[PDB]
Amino acid sequence: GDVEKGKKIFVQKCAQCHTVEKGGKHKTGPNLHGLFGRKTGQAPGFTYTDANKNKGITWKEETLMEYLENPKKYIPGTKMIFAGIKKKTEREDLIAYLKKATNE
């Protein structure tokens, strides 16, 4: 749960296509403010693939943990092209940063 170790991973691997702040813009991928507790494909204003819209699960540490390891495996047909984070601790660090930053 290293929130600052988490931030670095974020800058380095996700910042190219996402925003986490309130009212921040949609880049190639959607802004992430408010992820946690919300269903899949729910950022207002972003056009998601039907696969993402329809996944139908709630984002929490556990769904994020499985996803982030292999995004295309979890959301078949996703347009998010990213290989995933192999290491468990890296995924854990990034989730602790996201929980922090995505809820304010």
Ligand code: HEC
């Ligand atoms: C561009 C090359 C991307 C990188 C690098 C990362 N993401 Fe991404 N993400 C991107 C797109 C285009 C999409 C939408 C895909 C679709 O098929 O509609 C996504 C989606 C997400 C989601 C799902 C959000 C939801 O509303 O359910 C999440 C949590 C997400 N992206 C997070 C995320 C993180 C933490 C990343 C860094 C490891 C990351 N993405 C990389 C585009 C791109």
